[PDB]
Amino acid sequence: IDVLLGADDGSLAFVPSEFSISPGEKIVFKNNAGFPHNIVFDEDSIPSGVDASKISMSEEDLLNAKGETFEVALSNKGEYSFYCSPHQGAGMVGKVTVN
Amino acid sequence: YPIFAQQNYENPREATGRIVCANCHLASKPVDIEVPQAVLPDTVFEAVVKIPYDMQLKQVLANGKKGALNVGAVLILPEGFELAPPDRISPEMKEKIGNLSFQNYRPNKKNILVIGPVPGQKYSEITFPILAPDPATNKDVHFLKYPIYVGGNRGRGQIYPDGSKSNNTVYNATAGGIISKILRKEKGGYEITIVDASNERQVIDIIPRGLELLVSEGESIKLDQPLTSNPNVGGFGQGDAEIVLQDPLR
Ligand code: HEC
Ligand SMILES: [Cu+2]
């Protein structure tokens, strides 16, 4: 599934922000508008036993050019809450469910 | 951020005179602005805004870790005044503005400029290159004293645009009673169980990571009593200046 970082009107949001995927399916986050952006998974809001360092960017890492992508495949089932560290207060947050 | 005010507030100054960043940026901290006493028509001048704060302060970042603060500001100029173009900006002034990108609050509002978030260690004082208008080429601009308003913020805000609180604010108890259990979570954060003996009701208040608790198990808490410390070290402030668009004669 492809998720845009920043809407086509410059809105600070993941498009889509809430979606479901099968285990092993890849999620391609691509820089679209309002960058720099990054994708960080909430360590306290993912399925138990999952290492957030294996599926997220570092809070200090950033995608600062249009078209830059970060790909990740989730296998454990459950809900995963993620966010953009610099725009988390903007409401640039999302949640993916692996079913 | 300056984009949250631009996205849902058509004008940044409210009828009370308060700038809309104070709706989410709740701590008050001083902001300063130095502007030349008078300027001539069609001349570039600099509006320097100061957003000072102790630089050894570390705020709670959106993931619980502590880090440095970022600065942002909104400059409200009179109609006719706008950001000076690049060909009119001197080289002694281009190194002063670093490499900041001043954006218009909205494409129709060319007299309201916003900048940030930018790192506070580098931009505690920002220089806005403004071009003074010309009354001979603008019939609504006159040689008069004009008000200039500025809003300066440093640190993460407390409320998001949907009304949700961030982890950079105080977490209050949603019910009075006695704390029967405090579950310290694996990756940080807490789960506090309050037994409201007066209403025979059990409520669980969840606290995010990056915040330390001020309560112990078996302690009696009142409704809205602060259960954690206030982790906000930033704040928003506003100031105003008066500029005289001067006639080149007398
Ligand atoms: C509520 C809708 C807000 C309005 C209006 C404004 N800001 Fe804001 N800002 C808000 C939040 C919740 C956050 C935190 C985002 C996060 O998760 O980190 C912010 C953050 C900033 C920052 C960056 C702080 C830092 O990283 O240290 C700055 C520089 C900032 N905000 C400035 C600012 C200004 C000047 C505004 C008025 C135009 C403004 N914000 C409005 C919430 C809200
Ligand atoms: Cu982002």
Looking up residue A9, the CATH number of its domain turns out to be 2.60.40.420
Number of domain units in chain A: 1
Give me B188's structure tokens: 């940080």
Handedness of CA B162, B167, B168, B173 (dihedral sign): positive
Q: Which helix (DSSP H) or strand (DSSP E) does residue A95 occupy?
A: strand A93-98
CA Rg, chain B, in Å?
23
- What is the distance in angstroms between the Cα of B244 and the nearest Cα belonging to chain A? 37
Measured in degrees and rounded to the nearest 5, phi and psi for residue B80 equal 115, -40
Please indicate if the annotation marks A21 as binding a ligand.
Answer: no
- Label the pairing between strands B220-221 and B235-245: unpaired
Tell me the fold of B171-229.
OB fold (Dihydrolipoamide Acetyltransferase, E2P) (2.40.50)
Strand partners, A69: A30
- Contact between B153 and B69 under an 8 Å Cβ cutoff? The reply is no
Q: What CATH number has the domain spanning B1-170+230-250? A: 2.60.40.830
Q: Is A50 a catalytic residue?
A: no
List the residue whose alpha carbon is closest to atom 7 of ligand 1: B1
Count of C-beta atoms within a 10 Å radius of residue B243: 22
**Nearest residue to B148 via CA among B47, B9, B71, B44:** B47
Q: Is A92 a catalytic residue?
A: yes
Chains A and B form CB pairs within 8 A to the count of: 47
Handedness of CA B109, B110, B111, B114 (dihedral sign): positive
- Asked if the C-beta of B216 comes within 8 angstroms of chain A's C-beta atoms, the answer is no
Q: Which domain holds residue A7?
A: 1-99
Q: What is the DSSP letter of B10?
A: S
Q: How is chain B split into domains, by residue range?
A: 1-170+230-250, 171-229
Say yes or no for a CB contact (<8 Å) between B189 and A59: no
Asked how this structure was determined, the answer is NMR
Residue B22 CA: which ligand is closest?
1
- Rounded Cα–Cα distance for residues B225 and B207 (Å): 14
Where are the strands (E) in chain B, listed by range?
32-34, 38-39, 44-50, 59-60, 66-67, 70-76, 82-83, 103-106, 109-119, 125-131, 145-154, 177-184, 190-196, 201-207, 220-221, 235-245
Please check whether the two domains, B1-170+230-250 and B171-229, share a CATH topology. Answer: no
Say yes or no for a CB contact (<8 Å) between A89 and B61: no
- Contact between B246 and B37 under an 8 Å Cβ cutoff? The reply is no
